[PDB]
Amino acid sequence: GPLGSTSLVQGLTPPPDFNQCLKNSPDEKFFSDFSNNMGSRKNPDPLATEEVPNQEQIPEEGFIHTQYGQKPEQPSGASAGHRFPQGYHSDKRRLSKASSKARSDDLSV
């Protein structure tokens, strides 16, 4: 009728939204869909570690004690030449402290 004869605007169609003004927004993500979850930043390693005191694990500053030893390992018995289980004749018995009177094990160890 009047006020709506020629100019007929039908803007309520469910498929489109109309409320985004149909201006597309070809991007407007700022991350430009490069990943989006890329700028979160958890642990991208900004340095290498954090501290890096001795660079590549340098224990040899100048405190080489080794009074305890343990540098050639050898977890297989002891000695690799003469050996002991090939005779076992220790004439050195001047070692005390050892309560070797109950070395029969029993159940007291």
Q: Can you give the residue ranges of every domain in the chain?
A: 1-95
**Tokens 């009074």 belong to residue:** 67
Method in brief: NMR
* Residue 41 structure tokens: 């930043």
Q: Which of 35, 37, 17 is nearest to 25 (CA)?
A: 17
DSSP for 37-87, please give it.
TTSS-S---SSSSS--SSSS----SS----SS--SS---SSS-SSS-STTT
Structure tokens at 25: 């927004």
Enumerate residues 6+ apart whose C-beta is below 8 A from 100.
none
Pick the closest to residue 53 from 45, 42, 61 (CA basis).
Answer: 61
* Residue entry with tokens 């009047």: 2
45/18 Cα distance (integer angstroms): 45
What is the signed CA dihedral for 81, 85, 87, 93, rounded to 10 degrees?
100
Residue type, 62: G
With vertex at residue 19, the alpha carbon angle to CA 5 and CA 39, rounded to the nearest 5 degrees, is: 160
DSSP code at position 106: T
